[model samples]
Target: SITRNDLANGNSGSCPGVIFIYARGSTESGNLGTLGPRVASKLEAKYGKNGVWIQGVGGAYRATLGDNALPRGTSSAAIREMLGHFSDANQKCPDAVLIAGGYSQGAALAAASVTDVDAGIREKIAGAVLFGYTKNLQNRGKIPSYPEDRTKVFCNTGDLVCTGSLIVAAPHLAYQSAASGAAPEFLIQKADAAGAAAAAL
Candidate 1:
């Protein structure tokens, strides 16, 4: 299992084939929370720890109730952090396929931050997976500038958070088990495709 300490530090010395940048939900104990670590573990299982570098966004945003109440306000600080990670990944590991992911308010952070990424760095991002995404309704189920085929948003049957409501239901908290089943595979496929494209170039 990948711990918060393991993922808290962004890719430092390693130039992994895949770099996963994750953001946790509101009030979660660690930077990875429950969902991000689960997804990171699955990727590690498939590719080995050295093959995949996991990093979780860290800040004092707190992800409080009041923060979730506003759309854009939900991720201003996180956006800066995520963007920095993206730029670093591109500069440090040119061949690595960067994958961004988040759960709940963290999902909103991923969605909002990707829009500000530079075109050159954006090309390095292979895909994104958002669980219990808070901006599902506002984004019309799409993350701008990111290809729909490369993005996966998991909003369970009763997840009202996806509907633009502030209500947090059981489904919102269950993505670690439910969404974990497919999110990893999607990321692997995208990573493979990105590598192939890079090789062809």
Candidate 2:
């Protein structure tokens, strides 16, 4: 995937929103990162000229290696960098920096990410859609994967796979609806079929 070369490709289009898709799971994880041409074509058809396949521009990396990406340590670091870039661009355009679009493994990042502007960016950090995320709030042992104010989560309630019945070792959010069109009863339903359509921008 572009995670090795240039994943997000570049956000140049008619759309005012730039979707920064932070993916999750294994290297071959079939979530947002692997939403290929068929899916991109469908999205382009749906979103039209304004539609942007973020993976076409920026980049990605093996989740285990975590080295190919700009900052391998923290997802927030990567998001802040994107915000900084937007901050720089606003000097010339003065357009709003609306960040949130959708995401999976980026909850921790989106919740804690920030950016700086020379004129103090006049843009609002719009909201993000965290798909199939952990329903757990930050408790003693739990982590605050994402910020509460700016991001909203639409968790699949009846899905067993997402309810921690599948792989308890999995920390990534997995949306099963896109695959079954109904709530999933099993993990293989999402895995062998459609996989999650998660993203953040």
Candidate 3:
């Protein structure tokens, strides 16, 4: 049944204790990348049959917002509002909330979503993973920012995406090849790095 009352009431229909922020630079084509599959794999690994994923493009929101200029992704209130439809006793929010964002656009949108998770849900959120976050190393001035303690980011030093948008690609972008992109090569290298680190530990 449709209720005009809810819309007219200025109510946040319901609240989610946690939410996973899906990231994107474009609403049109951001999902056409390894980013989605990687996270899907992780969710399958983590939750098995219960794994469920939700995908939203800020670009879609951008288009909906206006014709003058694509705004800076979706707004925080919009995200919160979106969660109202998902609230149910079975899932107060989620046992674990994982975020996956891509490039400059995804970075900003995902950050806003996770940053303002309802306090109750935020406490239960597993973590966030920012893929291809923006900004220069000099400006960032660190290998990993402290704010990332709740969130983790995947980026590479050799790729131009890490350096600049001149490439407009992500970390470790290829399936498997001699040429490595940010997320592509990083996957293999980090696995090895993690293995080596484990051995020393």
lDDT of 1 by residue, 1-201 (tens): 333433345445667788898878888866788888788888888889888888887765466667888856375776888787777778777778888888898888888877779988877888999999898998988888878988999999899988888899888888866446699888889988998888898
Error of 3 at 198 (Å): 26
TM-score list, all predictions: 0.91, 0.45, 0.49
Candidate with better TM-score, 1 vs 2 = 1
**How many angstroms is residue 42 displaced in model 1 relative to the true structure, after the best TM-score fit?**
1.0
Order of the predicted models by lDDT, top scorer first: 1, 3, 2
lDDT of 1: 0.80
Q: How accurate is candidate 2 locally (lDDT)?
A: 0.34
Q: Pick the TM-score winner.
A: 1
Error of 1 at 192 (Å): 0.9
Off by over 4 Å in 3: 1-21, 27-34, 51-103, 135-147, 158-201
lDDT of 2 by residue, 1-201 (tens): 324211223433333332333344334344345422233333334335353333321332223334222232235444554455444334322332333322333332333343222224422433344444332232111224333444445455553323533222332434433422221112122222221222222
Kindly report which residue pairs in candidate 1 clash with one another: none
RMSD of 3: 10.0
